Design a protein around this ligand. Structure first.
Ligand SMILES: [Mg+2]
Length: 393
């Protein structure tokens, strides 16, 4: 096939019904690449994509070839599988999809009704591609079809209040015997689930605000300047180009995890690597300022927690009036009460306050009416990625 037939073939996979048998059957046909190499396992309800990207950036700056498996993509499909922050080239995706389909067709010649899902096909391809390219470590963000590895260190960023013990027990399945777990400051029910699991596995548990912390943090331009502290000391005046107070805990989790990786593998990691790797830690479409003149910021906050955390982040950055373009009525009532011009438009991959029929009509209106006013586009990551693909791709 071509690339276009290859990405359409990946999306043609079904919606099957538990354990990891189907993906392990497929992975045995690929020669078990999940059993070789080093891995960092990342799960959590929020902040896992941001942490994983930060861990990868810090490890790459120390001189390691880092594979990175994330979801979702923002600009193109190829962003889900990266090696040193470069998305898997089209032709390499064409080759890899052809190799995995060939092994899958061999498996269907034996077991006639064998199949896998879309995420299981992608995860198996990701794990085979990282071994083919021979990376030093692969940072794996949890989708659990990825739970077929023994990591060097596991990360559990958050189990947020949105049942808690039932969610925490599903998330604690990535914690393995003797392998250290780096977590955030978990809520009581999630913490009790983590404490009992690590007493069972015998794991070293490094927790945010206990073993490591951020004693100083403040805004500095479009990003934050902060100080990290642990048992080895402090690394002061670290800078990341990400706004939001919740990002202080994701970066701190990322720094602690990277240090736990290097100590376990006897790899040298300096504070310089951590500093340089945190400076390169850009995470697209998450309060990203994409244009200076005119001022345009894109964001994918989609819950009311995301709307409330955005509102105070926008208040921190802007003391002038802005136009906010929003992709239900409780999310829109807090936007109208806090901001100037507010436009409600439709999100592009969905179906059926000032109303606009599209985000382009709202953006053209604001630029025509008041050209010096900043525009923030928020409400969905799919709407935010549509604006980013249009305005930059
Ligand atoms: Mg993510």
């Amino acid at each position: 096939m071509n690339y276009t037939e290859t990405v359409a073939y990946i999306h043609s996979f079904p919606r099957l019904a538990g354990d990891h048998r189907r993906i392990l059957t497929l992975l045995h046909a690929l020669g078990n690449p999940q059993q070789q190499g080093r891995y960092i396992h990342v799960t959590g309800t929020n902040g896992k994509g941001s942490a994983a990207n930060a861990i990868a950036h810090v490890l790459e700056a120390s001189g390691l070839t880092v594979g990175l498996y994330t979801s979702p993509f923002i600009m193109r499909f190829n962003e889900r599988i990266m090696i040193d922050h470069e998305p898997i080239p089209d032709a390499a995706l064409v080759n890899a999809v052809a190799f995995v389909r060939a092994a899958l067709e061999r498996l269907q010649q034996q077991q006639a009704d064998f199949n896998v899902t879309e995420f299981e096909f992608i995860t198996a391809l990701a794990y085979w591609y990282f071994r083919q390219r021979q990376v030093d470590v692969a940072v794996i963000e949890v989708g659990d079809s990825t739970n077929v590895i023994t990591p060097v260190v596991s990360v559990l960023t958050e189990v947020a209040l949105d049942t808690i013990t039932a969610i925490a027990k599903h998330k604690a399945g990535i914690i393995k015997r003797g392998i250290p777990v780096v977590t955030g400051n978990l809520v009581p029910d999630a913490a009790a689930v983590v404490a009992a699991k690590v007493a069972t596995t015998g794991s070293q548990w490094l927790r945010f605000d206990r073993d490591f912390s951020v004693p100083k943090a403040k805004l500095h331009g479009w990003g934050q300047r902060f100080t990290y502290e642990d048992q080895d000391g402090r690394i002061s005046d670290l800078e990341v180009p990400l706004v939001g107070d919740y990002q202080q805990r994701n970066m701190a989790i990322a720094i602690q995890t990277a240090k736990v990786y290097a100590k376990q593998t006897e790899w040298p990691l300096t504070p310089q690597n951590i500093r340089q790797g945190l400076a390169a830690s850009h995470w697209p479409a998450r309060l990203e300022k994409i244009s200076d003149t005119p001022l345009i910021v894109i964001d994918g906050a989609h819950n009311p927690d995301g709307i409330n955390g955005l509102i105070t982040a926008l208040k921190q950055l802007f003391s002038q009036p802005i136009t906010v373009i929003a992709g239900y009525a409780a999310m829109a009532d807090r936007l109208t009460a806090a901001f100037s011009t507010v436009y409600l438009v439709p999100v592009p991959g969905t179906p059926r306050g000032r109303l606009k029929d599209s985000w382009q009509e709202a953006l053209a209106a604001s630029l025509n009416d008041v050209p010096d006013q900043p525009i923030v586009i928020t409400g969905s990551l799919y709407l935010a990625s549509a604006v980013r693909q249009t305005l930059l791709g």
